[PDB]
Every structure is written in structure tokens, then in C-alpha cells.
Amino acid sequence: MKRNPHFVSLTKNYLFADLQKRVAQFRLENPQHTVINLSIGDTTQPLNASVAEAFASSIARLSSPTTCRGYGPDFGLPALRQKLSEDFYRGFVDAKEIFISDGAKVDLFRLLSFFGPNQTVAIQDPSYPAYLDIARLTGAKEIIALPCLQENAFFPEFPEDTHIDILCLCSPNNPTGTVLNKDQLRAIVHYAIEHEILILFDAAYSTFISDPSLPKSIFEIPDARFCAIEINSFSKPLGFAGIRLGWTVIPQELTYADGHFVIQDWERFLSTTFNGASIPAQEAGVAGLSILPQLEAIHYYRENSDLLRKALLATGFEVFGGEHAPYLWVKPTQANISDRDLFDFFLREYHIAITPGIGFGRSGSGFVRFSSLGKREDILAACERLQM
Amino acid sequence: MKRNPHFVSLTKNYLFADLQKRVAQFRLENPQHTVINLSIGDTTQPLNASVAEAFASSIARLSSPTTCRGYGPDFGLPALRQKLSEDFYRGFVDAKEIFISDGAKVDLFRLLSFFGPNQTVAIQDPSYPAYLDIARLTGAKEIIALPCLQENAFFPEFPEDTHIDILCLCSPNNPTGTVLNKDQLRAIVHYAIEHEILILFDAAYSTFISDPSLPKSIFEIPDARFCAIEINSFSKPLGFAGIRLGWTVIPQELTYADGHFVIQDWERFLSTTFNGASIPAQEAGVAGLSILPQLEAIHYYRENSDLLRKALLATGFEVFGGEHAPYLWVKPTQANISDRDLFDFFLREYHIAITPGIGFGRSGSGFVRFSSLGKREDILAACERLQM
Numbered sequence A, B: 001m002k003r004n005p006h007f008v009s010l011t012k013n014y015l016f017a018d019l020q021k022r023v024a025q026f027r028l029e030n031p032q033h034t035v036i037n038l039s040i041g042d043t044t045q046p047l048n049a050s051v052a053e054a055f056a057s058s059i060a061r062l063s064s065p066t067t068c069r070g071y072g073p074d075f076g077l078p079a080l081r082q083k084l085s086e087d088f089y090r091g092f093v094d095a096k097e098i099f100i101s102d103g104a105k106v107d108l109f110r111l112l113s114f115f116g117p118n119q120t121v122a123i124q125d126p127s128y129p130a131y132l133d134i135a136r137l138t139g140a141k142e143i144i145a146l147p148c149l150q151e152n153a154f155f156p157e158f159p160e161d162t163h164i165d166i167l168c169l170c171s172p173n174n175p176t177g178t179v180l181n182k183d184q185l186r187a188i189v190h191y192a193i194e195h196e197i198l199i200l201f202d203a204a205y206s207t208f209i210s211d212p213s214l215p216k217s218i219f220e221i222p223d224a225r226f227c228a229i230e231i232n233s234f235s236k237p238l239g240f241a242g243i244r245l246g247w248t249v250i251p252q253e254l255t256y257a258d259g260h261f262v263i264q265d266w267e268r269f270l271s272t273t274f275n276g277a278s279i280p281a282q283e284a285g286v287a288g289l290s291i292l293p294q295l296e297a298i299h300y301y302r303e304n305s306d307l308l309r310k311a312l313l314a315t316g317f318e319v320f321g322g323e324h325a326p327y328l329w330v331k332p333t334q335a336n337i338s339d340r341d342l343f344d345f346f347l348r349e350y351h352i353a354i355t356p357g358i359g360f361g362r363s364g365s366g367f368v369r370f371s372s373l374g375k376r377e378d379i380l381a382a383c384e385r386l387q388m
Helices: A015-029 A049-062 A078-088 A104-115 A129-137 A182-194 A262-273 A279-291 A296-314 A342-350 A376-387 B015-029 B049-062 B078-088 B104-115 B129-137 B182-194 B262-273 B279-291 B296-314 B342-350 B376-387
Strands: A098-101 A120-125 A142-147 A166-170 A198-202 A228-233 A246-249 A318-321 A327-331 A368-371 B098-101 B120-125 B142-147 B166-170 B198-202 B228-233 B246-249 B318-321 B327-331 B368-371
Touching: A015 A342, A049 A279, A049 B049, A078 A098, A078 A279, A098 A104, A098 A262, A104 A129, A104 A198, A104 A228, A104 A246, A104 A262, A104 B262, A120 A129, A129 A142, A129 A166, A129 B262, A166 A182, A182 A198, A262 B104, A262 B129, A296 A318, A296 A327, A296 A376, A342 A376, B015 B342, B049 B279, B078 B098, B078 B279, B098 B104, B098 B262, B104 B129, B104 B198, B104 B228, B104 B246, B104 B262, B120 B129, B129 B142, B129 B166, B166 B182, B182 B198, B296 B318, B296 B327, B296 B376, B342 B376
Parallel strands: A120 A142, A120 A166, A166 A198, A198 A228, B120 B142, B120 B166, B166 B198, B198 B228
Antiparallel strands: A098 A246, A228 A246, A318 A327, A327 A368, B098 B246, B228 B246, B318 B327, B327 B368
16 A cells, blocks of 8 residues: 555644643743643533433433334434524524534535545635645645735635635634624625635534624525535534534535536435434434523633633733634734744743644734633633733 | 546445335235345344443533543543453454544545545455445545355455455455455465555454354454454444444554555544544443443344254255354355346245345345344244245
8 A cells, every 4th residue: 555645745733732732841841830721622511411311311212122223314313404404594404405424523524525636725814724634635736725814804815816616614713713794705605606616614613603693604695505515513612522413514506517416416425425423412412402592601601702802902902703702813912922932922921821823824923812711710810910 | 616526436226225115115016915124134123221321321421510521532532442452352452553433334434535546446246335335435446346255165256467455355244144264364464465455354243253263353363464454343233223433443563565654644634534433432332342242132143043044944045154244145046046036036935025146246146145133023934934
């Protein structure tokens, strides 16, 4: 066997692994300098109680002799496909267009592998680092970075006459924490149809959206069904620890250049390469959809975000995002801390670990990403250090 | 987007779907002719009780605030990797060589996609139909069918000076129900090393092996670590309904032509494209490994198989396999029932649905596959019809 060449292009980093070992390093050499890590995370948040109950009840069902498979589909439990259609998508998407998977990282990889090698793929800049790697691994001819800058309300800057096959969009965005609004999405969809671009719309942070005016799905947007696919899943920090579940939406209307429907090939691809999500995870998901309006956890984290924003602004920082996603995209203004300086700057001046914007790509230059997903104690501490 | 060409090569069938609709059809037009379906299946068999208990206990743990991620790896729960190493592989495989996934269909697809397009892949003939499809979908240059015939004790007939990159092996085999013994595997491994072939060894039926002399893993075979990967998982019919779990074994020693280690690239590939198996499924797996020696279910099905074999032989049928797998590979002898005749022949003469051998490939000609995975009532009925 020869080595895979699609493979040799990789180096990734890993951005967060390296930042983590560096935080550990700093902790070694600064034992009395207590560090509030906002560069990532908080796990520890437990599986929601009613979700867990449903999961166990499904297990109890599986162990009794009836029973019952249930091999799915394949495409998912009808009850989950239907509940996603109705409650999650507010009727914008039909049950038959929803394909249940075990999560949004696998799905992106399945989708990019489904579309094949030699595609040119555009991604927002700053970029979700996972995307570039999957793009390279699935054999992209080129990756085109699309500057999203606050001066443009984060609308991606499309390159003049450059061929794009796939546009990956993450909204709410990692790292900017911003959301493309209805007007912005309408223009992007119009742009995509005009240039024969397929949109992969990653909406995994959509539960974080906090004004009901904003779109939650790209299928709220005129003409999206002729050029877009959505991927989504439950947010672990919101209480889905242990639930391996996601979904992909393929509109009935979406076609290849020759008029073949994407959905028919996707169905065949999935059947050939995939066994379905587990029955208990799916039944847990049905119960998850029910408590999604409730969720005290979302409120807890929006509080974290508001707490952070105020401190940051009061210290003369410029703050973007954080309203509709668990990230704040933060610009000093300035003391001209260079890109290679930023991480040490925040550690040394505030004992706060962040992720420097530049690790996310060139348009991250000058910025830092704050994670809102942490204990209230750590957030409050962080606000003290900034208030000094 | 243009259509995927790797895709347009597909037609598969589906062999079992078509056979099923035909059994339903026959049931329509023959209401008083009761049909014993041995062409597939029996699901309904419930999740093992101690496995279910472990699963629920993991859920209870996830819902309590500690807690605790647990993102894995990535490569799997240390307790499961270690228990597979020690109990499942009897020490033949180290924990660090075992990569936990959500199942053996996904893993085959991951592996073939990991090795890349344009490979030439050899598969046993008669073939596990799923393999050909994944091979085509991942971009194989050619698929080479390897006749496995009873005259040769089912040893695959390798083609004279023909370039092979990957050899897929399924042992115990679907559809022949036979097992390649230590001597046969030793020769295949020697052949593979000499021709620079990588073996993908699918051992998903290995729990069915009933003499402790036979190898259960290819890593019992001299020199296998220089040319082989194993894939495996729990058998659903044995009591793992609802458990989305498999594993891949990459030996530390395995290298590409240039001397790079496969295991290092596999680790990177998996991290980039995969989030891990669910924690509850893995903890359930640990408990599954414990009861694997016990398993009344294996005994139940071996009984089914012995029952079938006797009836078949007493009716002058030639029977192969069935000792170490839940399939019997059966030859009339003859009444010269053509290949297109066989399914109707068994339905009409015995009210037994089987899968004709020819659906599995050219070397299936003249044979029929019996499934041993059914209720004792249906097996006994089937034996009556054959005893006439």
C-alpha cells in the first residue's frame, strides 16, 4: 500500500491541543497565578434528566422480548424525523428530507466524501478549523478563504470570477459568534444559484439564537432548496452528554448540474456506507426536542456571555458576537499586541486563557475568541480580572 | 455540483430487498402455502439483560453532575480497549492497536476511504455484497473476484500475475459459513507479503467459531502484523440489539511501501473524521465481553444449524459451513435446478425462502444460502418439509 496523498497535505495543528498544553505549561511555571480557561469547553455539564429517562426507557424496551428491529431505516426513526420536521424546523422541512446520523463531524465528512475529490471549496475566514481538514482529506482541489470582517457585518467577501463548487457556512459562527441574518442569507443563496455553488449550512449552534426574528435554518430563505444542505445536531454543553446524534437535510428540489436529484444519490450512499444512529439515542432525541424550549442551560450561558461582554467593554475592548452563540470575538483597541503575543498577553495580564483569532485564519488577525461555556464562578473571576 | 462518478458505477440490487419483496409477493398469491423464511435474519432477539443493565448504569452516571468527558479518545474508552485486548483477543493485540467505532459497516467504509481511490481490490467469490459496493464507492480501479470453492476447501484462487492492492477477507464467511484455518491464513499472509497486498480481515462472525483450535483473529497468524488489519464488532442476533459499536485493529508494525506506519495516519484520519462511539455503548460493550463465553444464544443457533444440516443431508443435499457461522451453503445434487430457478424451487417444493448462491457472485452458481438465525419453531418446520 502506498500512502494516501490526500493525507500528506494535512498538518492541521492542533490549534486547541497546542493551546491546552501551553496553558498546562503556564500552570507548571506559575503555581500561584490561577488561570481561568476561557479558550474552550466546559464539559462536566450532565445529561439532561428527561433525556436520560427516555434513553433508559428505550434500553428497557430493547431488552424485553418483542423486539423488534428497527434497523431504522437507515434514514432514522420516523418519530424523530417527524418531530425534527415539526418542532425543530417549524414545518420548513419535511420528514423525508431529514437523515438521522451519529453526529455533525461524521456528517460533514460523509457529505464531502459523497460529493467527491477535486472540488474547490470555500469556507469563512476566520474558519472552523475542523472544516479545512475534512476538505483536504476528501480531496479538495483548492480551499478558498472568505474574509468575514466586522466592517462588512461579517458578510463573506467573495472573490471576483473564481470558480467555487461548495460553500461551507457555519451560522451561528465559530469563532465570531455571529449569525448571518435573513437578508444576508438571501443574498448568499442568490449568489450561489448564479454561480452554481452548493451550500453546506452548518447550523449546529442554532439553539443559541436568542431573537426569534433571525433565521434558524437556511430553509427559511427563498430559493435555498435549489442550492443548500443543512447539518445540525444537539449541543452537548446544553445537556446531551452521551448522545451520539445528528442529522442532515437534503431538500427534495436539490439537483446536480444534469438535473439528477441529490437526495436519491444521498439515500443510496447512506444505505451503502452507514447503519443508522442507535435506537436509544434517537428516542432520547425525541425527548430532547421537547425540552429544547425550556433549557435553563441556554439561559445560564447567555448570562455568562452578557457578564463577559460588559467587563470587556468597560475595559475598552471591542466585542462582537456572543448574543446567539457561546463565543465572543474580541478586539483590544489596542496596545498593539501582535498575533504571536495575544495568548501570552491575556494569560500574563489577566490570567485568562483564550484562543487567538489568528489560529482560525488570516481574517482572525487582531482578535481573540472567548468561550462563554464555563462555570459561573470562572466567568465572574474573569470579570474581576478585567475590571482589575 | 456535478454528479459523483464513483457513484454512477453502482447498481447493487439490492439482493435481499428484492428477495424479500418476492417472498411477500409469493405470500400474497399463496395464502395457504405457509413460508418459512430462512433467507435472512431473525431480529426480535432482545438486548442481553446484563448488557442493558450496564448501558442504563452508564446513562445514570452521565446524568449526574460530575461529569466528566470523556470525549474518549476519539480512539475509545481505555477500559474497553483493554478488555478487548485481554479477553476478546486473548493478548494477541495490544490496547493501543484497537480503535473503537460505531460499527463494522462504517469501519469498512472508513478504511477503504482512508486508503484512497484507484486501488485494485480483491474479494472472495461468493462475495459479501456490501463489500463490492463500498469498494466501488471509494473509487476502486478494479474489483477482482476470488473463487472460493469447496473443491479447494474454499481457499481463494489467486489470479496469475495480477496486481492486487487490498485483499478483503470475511472469515467466518458470508455466504459459505466456512472458516479459513491457521494453515490457510498462514499461506494467504505469506502470499500477501510477497505481493505487497494489504489484508482487510473481517472477523465479525468470530464468536460463532466452535472449535478452539481454529484461529479467531488474523493476529494469531505468523507475519499478519506486516500486512493485515482486522475489523470486528458484536453480533446483534447474539443479544446486542441497540448497541452501535465496532472496532478496527491496526498493528504497530504495519507500514506503507515507503516505511511510514499505517497506525499514525489512521489515528490522524480518525481524529479528523470521527467523534468516537457513545460512552454508554462502550460501557455496555465492556459488560458484553464478560458474558460472551456464556451466551446461551450461540448454543441456541448452533442447535438450529445442526437441526437443518441433518434434514438437508438426509434429503441428499450437500451441506457446507454452518459449524462456525450462522449460514449453511447448500448444493442440491441435483435435479439440475438452474440458478434463476433455485429460489422458486425452494419456495414451491418446501415453502422455504433461501438466498440463491448466484446473487453472491459467479462462484455461488449451483448453491443456496440457508440462514440459521431464526426461531426454533421455523427451523423445525423447515426440517419437516425437507423430511417430507
